[PDB]
Design an enzyme around this catalytic site. Sequence first.
Site, PDB file in Angstrom:
ATOM      1  N   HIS A 102      83.601   3.621  45.081  1.00 12.63           N
ATOM      2  CA  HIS A 102      83.350   2.298  44.480  1.00 12.63           C
ATOM      3  C   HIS A 102      83.113   2.367  42.973  1.00 12.63           C
ATOM      4  O   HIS A 102      82.630   1.371  42.398  1.00 12.63           O
ATOM      5  CB  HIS A 102      82.205   1.515  45.155  1.00 12.63           C
ATOM      6  CG  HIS A 102      80.874   1.908  44.625  1.00 12.63           C
ATOM      7  ND1 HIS A 102      80.026   2.796  45.227  1.00 12.63           N
ATOM      8  CD2 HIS A 102      80.276   1.551  43.465  1.00 12.63           C
ATOM      9  CE1 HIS A 102      78.933   2.955  44.476  1.00 12.63           C
ATOM     10  NE2 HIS A 102      79.076   2.193  43.418  1.00 12.63           N
ATOM     11  N   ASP A 110      82.280   6.385  50.535  1.00 11.09           N
ATOM     12  CA  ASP A 110      82.269   6.118  49.080  1.00 11.09           C
ATOM     13  C   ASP A 110      82.456   7.481  48.457  1.00 11.09           C
ATOM     14  O   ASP A 110      81.598   8.081  47.821  1.00 11.09           O
ATOM     15  CB  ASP A 110      80.993   5.397  48.842  1.00 11.09           C
ATOM     16  CG  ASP A 110      80.693   4.753  47.554  1.00 11.09           C
ATOM     17  OD1 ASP A 110      81.512   4.614  46.651  1.00 11.09           O
ATOM     18  OD2 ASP A 110      79.509   4.384  47.452  1.00 11.09           O
ATOM     19  N   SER A 158      76.057   6.009  40.086  1.00 14.57           N
ATOM     20  CA  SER A 158      76.924   6.423  41.230  1.00 14.57           C
ATOM     21  C   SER A 158      77.762   7.609  40.915  1.00 14.57           C
ATOM     22  O   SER A 158      78.101   7.807  39.753  1.00 14.57           O
ATOM     23  CB  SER A 158      77.668   5.164  41.703  1.00 14.57           C
ATOM     24  OG  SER A 158      76.528   4.427  42.288  1.00 14.57           O
TER      25      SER A 158
HETATM   26  C1  LIG Z   1      78.039   2.461  42.240  1.00 13.32           C
HETATM   27  C2  LIG Z   1      76.564   2.705  42.225  1.00 13.32           C
HETATM   28  O1  LIG Z   1      76.258   2.934  40.853  1.00 13.32           O
HETATM   29  C3  LIG Z   1      75.651   1.786  42.939  1.00 13.32           C
HETATM   30  C4  LIG Z   1      74.434   2.475  43.542  1.00 13.32           C
HETATM   31  C5  LIG Z   1      73.072   2.256  42.852  1.00 13.32           C
HETATM   32  C6  LIG Z   1      72.040   2.993  43.642  1.00 13.32           C
HETATM   33  N1  LIG Z   1      70.902   2.121  43.990  1.00 13.32           N
HETATM   34  C7  LIG Z   1      69.754   2.777  44.369  1.00 13.32           C
HETATM   35  N2  LIG Z   1      68.633   2.102  44.632  1.00 13.32           N
HETATM   36  N3  LIG Z   1      69.772   4.111  44.459  1.00 13.32           N
HETATM   37  N4  LIG Z   1      76.260   0.765  43.708  1.00 13.32           N
HETATM   38  C8  LIG Z   1      76.494  -0.475  43.885  1.00 13.32           C
HETATM   39  O2  LIG Z   1      76.077  -1.443  43.205  1.00 13.32           O
HETATM   40  C9  LIG Z   1      77.230  -0.900  45.172  1.00 13.32           C
HETATM   41  C10 LIG Z   1      78.627  -1.376  45.043  1.00 13.32           C
HETATM   42  C11 LIG Z   1      78.683  -2.766  45.504  1.00 13.32           C
HETATM   43  C12 LIG Z   1      77.241  -3.218  45.788  1.00 13.32           C
HETATM   44  N5  LIG Z   1      76.411  -2.049  45.651  1.00 13.32           N
HETATM   45  C13 LIG Z   1      75.132  -1.862  45.903  1.00 13.32           C
HETATM   46  O3  LIG Z   1      74.523  -0.798  45.795  1.00 13.32           O
HETATM   47  C14 LIG Z   1      74.400  -3.073  46.425  1.00 13.32           C
HETATM   48  N6  LIG Z   1      73.039  -3.122  45.813  1.00 13.32           N
HETATM   49  C15 LIG Z   1      74.233  -3.080  47.923  1.00 13.32           C
HETATM   50  C16 LIG Z   1      75.424  -2.932  48.790  1.00 13.32           C
HETATM   51  C17 LIG Z   1      76.378  -3.915  48.853  1.00 13.32           C
HETATM   52  C18 LIG Z   1      77.492  -3.806  49.683  1.00 13.32           C
HETATM   53  C19 LIG Z   1      77.617  -2.678  50.480  1.00 13.32           C
HETATM   54  C20 LIG Z   1      76.630  -1.678  50.453  1.00 13.32           C
HETATM   55  C21 LIG Z   1      75.533  -1.846  49.633  1.00 13.32           C
END
Ligand SMILES: *C[C@@](*)(O)[C@H](CCCNC(N)=[NH2+])NC(=O)[C@@H]1CCCN1C(=O)[C@H](N)Cc1ccccc1
Lengths: 251, 251, 27, 27, 17
Positions: free
Chosen positions: A43, A99, A200
């Site tokens: 993602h 992912d 991420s």
């Molecule tokens: C891509 C990343 O940088 C990130 C993860 C951040 C980690 N958060 C914590 N607390 N460690 N991801 C994202 O934003 C992803 C992609 C789309 C939405 N998303 C989320 O993390 C949302 N907050 C939740 C989510 C939505 C849809 C499907 C799974 C989780």
Amino acid sequence: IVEGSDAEIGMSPWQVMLFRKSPQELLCGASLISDRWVLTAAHCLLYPPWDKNFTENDLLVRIGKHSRTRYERNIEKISMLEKIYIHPRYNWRENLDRDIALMKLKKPVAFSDYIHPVCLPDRETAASLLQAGYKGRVTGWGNLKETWTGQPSVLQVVNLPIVERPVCKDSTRIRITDNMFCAGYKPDEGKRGDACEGDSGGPFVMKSPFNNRWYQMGIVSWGEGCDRDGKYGFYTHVFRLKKWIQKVIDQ
Amino acid sequence: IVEGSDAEIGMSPWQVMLFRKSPQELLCGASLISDRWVLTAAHCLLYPPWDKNFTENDLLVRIGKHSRTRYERNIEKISMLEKIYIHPRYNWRENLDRDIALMKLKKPVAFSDYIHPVCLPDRETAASLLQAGYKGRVTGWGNLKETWTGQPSVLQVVNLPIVERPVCKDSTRIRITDNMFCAGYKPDEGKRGDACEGDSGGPFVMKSPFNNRWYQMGIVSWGEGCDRDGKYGFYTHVFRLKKWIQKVIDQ
Amino acid sequence: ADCGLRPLFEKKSLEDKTERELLESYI
Amino acid sequence: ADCGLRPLFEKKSLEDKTERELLESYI
Amino acid sequence: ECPEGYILDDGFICTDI
Ligand SMILES: *C[C@@](*)(O)[C@H](CCCNC(N)=[NH2+])NC(=O)[C@@H]1CCCN1C(=O)[C@H](N)Cc1ccccc1
Ligand SMILES: *C[C@@](*)(O)[C@H](CCCNC(N)=[NH2+])NC(=O)[C@@H]1CCCN1C(=O)[C@H](N)Cc1ccccc1
């Protein structure tokens, strides 16, 4: 990384900063796993609901950084993608299941005291360090505060424990799968932490007490908010995907 | 500069680069005349035909450079405009008459072995030195070839003879004024060199044999082509625009 | 294959500020 | 006032590779 | 912010690499 520390020089060589070329700014983490393969979160590349979809040409790869901002000149290395592969069963549409993404560099990388690869686990090792209790280390340059939208100027380390399946599933409303894992302290364990927006791809490693080498267990994938009580973050389960990895890297 | 050489380090202290914040790209030249005042050619900031009009906010002044591109971190001093003043009888519409601007920085500049100001002429230094036949020296990181529209990798220096009122005038179809001057070899003298696009504002200086200091005599203003057989470059006449300078420079 | 062994640590054979934490978590 | 006295040169009392073509120029 | 280049961080000037 929320509630982290400041990384130490040369402390985490497999870390990669994935760079958006334009506007010049940070995308995500990655991990050098060899001298021409890098592993990130799928993602980071594609996320149709926000209309994210990059090519091996929208990204720049930075190996051997510390400082988020500074273009560390004779330390740091910048590379460019030859290919990029997203796990075909990556679920962007539901809950981000699988992912995992692999991007292959155009040329190999020079390993300095600062550019060095991390090991992938064995059904063998995978089996004894991946367990509730055991702390893994998370790394990055994204958001410090759940809501600061800010960013660290230097790498951030944070060492969180691995939480128990239910705990996790009971933690969120999302569909948790076998290719995920959640990490963190309970609302009452009197310590904090967490990865967050902008983190991420970054590695969630573990140091083998046996062969005494650093391994990658997860890939920071998703979460809900940042360093929020009784709420844990999810990491792609790398060893369950170890064979797709095996697979693309060969041929 | 066309038909130039590479500048030797610390060879042109007063030289100033005037950079467009976005797209980050070179715009023109400048000379440092004092610690918080800078002198540039007016069409660098305003040229209605071409839709040019910048402010104390789209420009960065880059002082004490050599490498055109490399962000020379410990030597150069980037600064910002507090206010830009253009000669009130600057002629865009007809022949660029009085191509003069003055931009005064928010804060003064640190003099390095690299950052050092150039002196303005006296009615007399300006007098005996501004004579046809005498060489002046031009410098800049503009276009290398009339048509390469390439670019110098390091500052460019080039020495040229001051030509005569007549020659210049007959040299063109454009209207000459008491406030311009031409410089360059006759298409018969078997030598070359010219200033060219991306060169305006840079200093045309002469070293005084009396006091042995360097004076600024011309400003790179205009031309027809670059390093063209029997066509000379026009420099703004600083000695003669000097009371306005002395003026803006009280308030 | 040289992997996961840190030039400036695992080789010079020094420990980083907080890895003791980790190693202490297992068992 | 300190002006036009290049530090890596006029003060270290060293000449640039071409400033003397300039002088033979003047008179 | 452009070709070849890379944004450094003191007057976020581009460093061309
Ligand atoms: C891509 C990343 O940088 C990130 C993860 C951040 C980690 N958060 C914590 N607390 N460690 N991801 C994202 O934003 C992803 C992609 C789309 C939405 N998303 C989320 O993390 C949302 N907050 C939740 C989510 C939505 C849809 C499907 C799974 C989780
Ligand atoms: C702005 C400076 O970069 C440049 C002159 C470069 C040096 N010339 C040579 N070859 N030594 N000036 C300009 O571009 C000015 C402003 C607008 C047009 N212009 C020109 O020089 C034209 N090429 C010719 C000209 C047009 C209009 C009025 C006067 C001259």
